[PDB]
């Protein structure tokens, strides 16, 4: 109830980091489609 | 005199809850100020935890 809870909350925050990276991935594919359609 | 009275009051208030705050912080060292869980600590009575 100290070390496991600290590491679990850390792992929850890491999953939130993965969600922010996949939102950045969606920004990336929006950029890719914008440049490809303009070309 | 003001500094001495304030320091004596501060030393008394620190000594009134010195070891128990340390023990509660050592117990609650994983969620101290995490934004999902408030930890109500209570310096409560003897072994009637049920």
Automatic annotation (TrEMBL), chain A:
<feature type="coiled-coil region">
    <location>
        <begin position="2"/>
        <end position="39"/>
    </location>
</feature>
<protein>
    <submittedName>
        <fullName>V-type ATP synthase, subunit (VAPC-THERM)</fullName>
    </submittedName>
</protein>
From TrEMBL, chain B:
<protein>
    <submittedName>
        <fullName>V-type ATP synthase subunit I</fullName>
    </submittedName>
</protein>
<comment type="similarity">
    <text>Belongs to the V-ATPase 116 kDa subunit family.</text>
</comment>
<feature type="coiled-coil region">
    <location>
        <begin position="1"/>
        <end position="24"/>
    </location>
</feature>
